[PDB]
Design a protein around this ligand. Structure first.
Ligand SMILES: [Ca+2]
Length: 103
């Protein structure tokens, strides 16, 4: 699953993802509008207004599940994008990625 946390409404926040039985976050190293678009679609929003780096909505906790993700932009969910490994060592939660969706 996917949820947004820390925003002014459910349309934005730190991106969190459920994997290996655990809610985790996304590192901002390769975070950009194409994958923001996919995250926003999978949440039922029609588009992405902005992507935010550097724990813009505050740091998450626990596993950092994704770092090097590639989406074309049209995928239904982030699990459908190109993911070479789940779970990353390269990152701190000060890098947790965030998104602001169109509603
Ligand atoms: Ca970074």
């Amino acid at each position: 699953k996917v949820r947004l946390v820390g925003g002014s409404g459910p349309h934005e926040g730190r991106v969190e993802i459920l994997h290996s039985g655990q809610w985790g976050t996304i590192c901002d190293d390769r975070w950009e509008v194409r994958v923001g678009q996919v995250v926003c679609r999978s949440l039922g929003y029609p588009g992405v207004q902005a992507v935010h780096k550097a724990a813009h909505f505050g740091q998450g906790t626990g596993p950092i599940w994704l770092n090097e993700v590639f989406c074309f932009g049209r995928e239904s969910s982030i699990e459908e994008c190109k993911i070479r490994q789940w779970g990353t060592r390269a990152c701190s939660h000060s890098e947790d990625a965030g998104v602001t969706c169109t509603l």
